[PDB]
Amino acid sequence: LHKEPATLIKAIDGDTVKKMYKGQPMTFRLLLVDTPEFNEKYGPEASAFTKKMVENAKKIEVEFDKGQRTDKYGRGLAYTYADGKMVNEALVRQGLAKVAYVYKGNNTHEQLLRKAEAQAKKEKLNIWS
Ligand SMILES: Cc1cn([C@H]2C[C@H](OP(=O)(O)O)[C@@H](COP(=O)(O)O)O2)c(=O)[nH]c1=O
Numbered sequence: 618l619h620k621e622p623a624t625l626i627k628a629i630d631g632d633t634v635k636k637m638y639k640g641q642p643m644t645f646r647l648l649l650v651d652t653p654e655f656n657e658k659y660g661p662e663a664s665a666f667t668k669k670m671v672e673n674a675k676k677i678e679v680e681f682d683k684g685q686r687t688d689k690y691g692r693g694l695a696y697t698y699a700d701g702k703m704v705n706e707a708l709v710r711q712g713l714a715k716v717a718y719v720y721k722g723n724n725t726h727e728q729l730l731r732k733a734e735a736q737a738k739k740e741k742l743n744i745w746s
């Protein structure tokens with residue numbers, strides 16, 4: 618897998634971020650995670666956590682996995698990095714996302730994220746509290 622440039626356009630919610638990628642606006646849906654909707658418990662905290670992380674970064678990158686790069690809604694499917702730190706893993710490590718939507722061939726970082734979820738759950742963080 619390879620990191621590619623993108624620039625933030627807008628943080629949308631805990632697991633959706635609009636970016637400019639190869640010069641075009643695209644909504645990205647973060648691989649392998651599920652954050653609560655804004656209207657559910659922890660939904661506002663997940664949205665806030667992703668927002669701060671992408672807005673504060675000097676460098677945003679996207680990393681596609683080995684399979685499909687867009688979902689049925691036209692959203693990009695990628696891992697998102699903010700100053701080299703993976704937002705997907707960070708949300709899971711903080712108990713603000715569950716590992717979810719693990720489809721074969723887009724699951725390179727599955728075990729990394731499950732490990733983060735185990736530790737969030739051991740700490741009883743947020744969703745796991
Ligand atoms: C994360 C992800 C979601 N999706 C689709 C599955 C779900 O379809 P349905 O909309 O039919 O439930 C939806 C979940 O996204 P959200 O969690 O953003 O709603 O996005 C993919 O197809 N591949 C993916 O990797």
Ligand SMILES: [Ca+2]
Binds near residue numbers: 632651653654
């Ligand atoms: Ca969601």
